[PDB]
Design a binder for these strands. Structure first.
Ligand code: K
Ligand code: MG
Ligand code: MG
Ligand code: MG
Ligand code: MG
Ligand code: MG
Ligand code: MG
Ligand code: MG
Ligand code: MG
Ligand code: MG
Ligand code: MG
Ligand code: MG
Ligand code: MG
Ligand code: MG
Ligand code: MG
Ligand code: MG
Ligand code: MG
Ligand code: MG
Ligand code: MG
Ligand code: MG
Ligand code: MG
Ligand code: MG
Ligand code: MG
Ligand code: MG
Ligand code: MG
Ligand code: MG
Ligand code: MG
Ligand code: MG
Ligand code: MG
Ligand code: MG
Ligand code: MG
Ligand code: MG
Ligand code: MG
Ligand code: MG
Ligand code: MG
Ligand code: MG
Ligand code: MG
Ligand code: MG
Ligand code: MG
Ligand code: MG
Ligand code: MG
Ligand code: MG
Ligand code: MG
Ligand code: MG
Ligand code: MG
Ligand code: MG
Ligand code: MG
Ligand code: MG
Ligand code: MG
Ligand code: MG
Ligand code: MG
Ligand code: MG
Ligand code: ZN
Lengths: 18, 125, 141, 23, 60
RNA sequence: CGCGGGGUGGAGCAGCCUGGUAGCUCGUCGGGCUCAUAACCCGAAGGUCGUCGGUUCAAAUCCGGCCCCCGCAACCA
RNA sequence: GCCCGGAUAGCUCAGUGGUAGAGCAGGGGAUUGAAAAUCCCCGUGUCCUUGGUUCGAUUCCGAGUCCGGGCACCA
RNA sequence: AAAAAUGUUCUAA
RNA sequence: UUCGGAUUGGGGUCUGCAACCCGACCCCAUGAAGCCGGAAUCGCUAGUAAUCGCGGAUCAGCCAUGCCGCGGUGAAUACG
């Protein structure tokens, strides 16, 4: 639900956090 | 069983036969022969037992060798695994020690290839 | 259920049941015992029925000693066959038990608790029995 | 051979100098 | 991580070793030519415009 | 506890008779060819032989008991 | 009345003494333009009750309940 | 005068 | 094997605030696999291929055996 790939299950958003 | 425990091959020059002793590469053979006055080019079967006992004495005492060197090498590796340092763990797991890649190489350190199954490609359809 | 792990021979001839028990006639381990008054072949099934009755009467408490062992193979022909053609097949195991044998003992339990448990135990058995407590005669042996 | 650091050949390869190839 | 790294490369660092080039045109960290202060792309862009003194597509 | 046969890589079959040896086809795994799959070609792995007991220097193989799986039989009344 | 067999996740079923798997259903990731398929990850449970053996039992032994079935004129 | 099978759904920009 | 120089022990040097993870280099010692490579498969028609070394960009250093260039030596064969 955060920045880039892979996806965290929310649309558009990924697992990487800042 | 001449020197030290090693029967160094006759029919070869001294400087080379000496290398057949665990602990003596080409450079140390250059010393012992200079430091004891034997021709580096004399075939081993052609050494006077004066030269033999001369060379044997210096070789056997200047540096440490076949079985003792092996034991000091062993104690150092043994030491690293005991303290539990990084090089120690890489000796336990039998992996490379000097920072090589292990993704794709290291067969000297790892052994023959233990091939396992791979991820399957999907079928069509 | 009890039975021998191994046997030298599979089938045994039928016994005789003469005389008082050979040994095991005195309380050996516990405080109270159950004594045979008649001879019989006691079955593995009967022995296990007496044991579980006492176990549930102690609600797992106390100790139980089985001082008989069904080592004797008990043979039986299939139903509706004629005589002959060799001996029937082993169908279970019995313990030979002559009068005066201490078959069971209990310990670590109230007298009242032992008495009841040995009474119930006795109702599983095909012989008259007796309850006993360990006297000095038992300790003299 | 070129992988042998201990020769005038291997120092020519790794572009280094030393006892085994001085200057 | 773009603009705050455009700035950071300018700042004089806590240590000499932490210095690094960036394209002064686009900000690229990689393929930065010292002579121009430019990455290999901006180089090819400004070149083809003739905005780069004396630079000319070589051939031989 | 009528008689007969069977139990061995994942599947289907050899090996047993005649004690010292595990074999064949498919299948599985790795690599080739193909744009790609299949066919095809090159390699590899996997069975202590239903089970317990005995005989033997040695048991899948010989002998007993147990489990299981097919088959056959049950006539005169 | 007596004999055999079944009971484990929401559903269909594996499992041979140290409380456990699968498939399928649903969701997410990878993959895709988006799907199908394939691969990964996630939630699933007093393993029907009761007694016993055991340090320990879904697992071995007995019973019970429910279901599912089996007995056999006679000349 | 031809060894050799096949290419999931919707979309064709 | 005076072929090969991987791996490991020890001892140094340098760059760098700093080389445990994770640098290059030096010297002692160690001295693996490898005896020309299954099915299969790539490049090149001439100063080419093959073989030899040199330089530069990046860059403190460097994991470059990579890349872009440079000249030395210099073939084989094309019937169709
Ligand atoms: K008749
Ligand atoms: Mg990833
Ligand atoms: Mg951040
Ligand atoms: Mg040596
Ligand atoms: Mg590494
Ligand atoms: Mg399908
Ligand atoms: Mg009799
Ligand atoms: Mg008398
Ligand atoms: Mg008696
Ligand atoms: Mg006595
Ligand atoms: Mg009876
Ligand atoms: Mg009888
Ligand atoms: Mg008889
Ligand atoms: Mg009988
Ligand atoms: Mg009675
Ligand atoms: Mg009394
Ligand atoms: Mg830098
Ligand atoms: Mg830069
Ligand atoms: Mg089988
Ligand atoms: Mg066959
Ligand atoms: Mg045969
Ligand atoms: Mg044979
Ligand atoms: Mg075979
Ligand atoms: Mg394959
Ligand atoms: Mg295409
Ligand atoms: Mg294919
Ligand atoms: Mg048998
Ligand atoms: Mg045997
Ligand atoms: Mg045997
Ligand atoms: Mg054999
Ligand atoms: Mg007739
Ligand atoms: Mg009835
Ligand atoms: Mg039942
Ligand atoms: Mg899905
Ligand atoms: Mg996820
Ligand atoms: Mg996408
Ligand atoms: Mg999607
Ligand atoms: Mg039960
Ligand atoms: Mg059971
Ligand atoms: Mg044809
Ligand atoms: Mg088809
Ligand atoms: Mg050598
Ligand atoms: Mg050499
Ligand atoms: Mg070292
Ligand atoms: Mg480092
Ligand atoms: Mg050779
Ligand atoms: Mg070749
Ligand atoms: Mg051409
Ligand atoms: Mg060469
Ligand atoms: Mg260069
Ligand atoms: Mg550099
Ligand atoms: Mg490295
Ligand atoms: Zn730029």
């Amino acid at each position: 639900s955060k920045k880039s790939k892979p996806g965290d299950g929310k649309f558009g958003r990924g697992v990487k956090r800042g | 069983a001449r020197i030290a425990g090693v029967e160094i091959p006759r029919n070869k020059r001294v400087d080379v036969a000496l290398t057949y002793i665990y602990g003596i590469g080409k450079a140390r053979a250059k010393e012992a022969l200079e430091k004891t006055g034997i021709n580096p080019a004399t075939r081993v079967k052609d050494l006077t037992e004066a030269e033999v006992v001369r060379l044997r004495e210096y070789v056997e005492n200047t540096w440490k060798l076949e079985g003792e060197l092996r034991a000091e090498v062993a104690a150092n590796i043994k030491r690293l695994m005991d303290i539990g340092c990084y090089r120690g763990l890489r000796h336990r797991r039998g992996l490379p020690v000097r920072g090589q890649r292990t993704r794709t190489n290291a067969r000297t350190r790892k052994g023959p290839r233990k091939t396992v199954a791979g991820k399957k490609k999907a079928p069509r359809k | 259920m009890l039975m021998p792990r191994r046997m030298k021979y599979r089938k045994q001839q039928r016994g005789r049941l003469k005389g008082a028990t050979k040994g095991g006639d005195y309380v050996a381990f516990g405080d109270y015992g159950l004594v045979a008054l008649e001879p019989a072949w006691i079955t593995a099934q009967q022995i296990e029925a007496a044991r579980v009755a006492m176990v549930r009467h102690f609600r797992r408490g106390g100790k139980i000693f089985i001082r008989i062992f069904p080592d004797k193979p008990y043979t039986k022909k299939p139903l509706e066959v004629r005589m002959g053609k060799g001996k029937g097949n082993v169908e279970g195991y019995v313990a030979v038990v002559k009068p005066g044998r201490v078959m069971f003992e209990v310990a670590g339990v109230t007298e009242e608790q032992a008495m009841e448990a040995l009474r119930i135990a006795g109702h599983k058995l095909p012989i008259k029995t007796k309850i006993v407590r360990r006297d000095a005669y038992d300790e003299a042996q | 051979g070129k992988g042998d650091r201990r020769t005038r050949r291997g120092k020519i390869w790794r572009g280094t100098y030393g006892k085994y190839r001085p200057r | 991580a773009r603009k705050a790294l455009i700035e950071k490369a300018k700042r004089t660092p806590k240590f000499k070793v932490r210095a690094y080039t960036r394209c002064v045109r686009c900000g690229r960290a990689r393929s930065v030519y010292r002579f121009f202060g430019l990455c290999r792309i901006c180089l090819r862009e400004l070149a083809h415009k003739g905005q780069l003194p004396g630079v000319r597509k070589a051939s031989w």
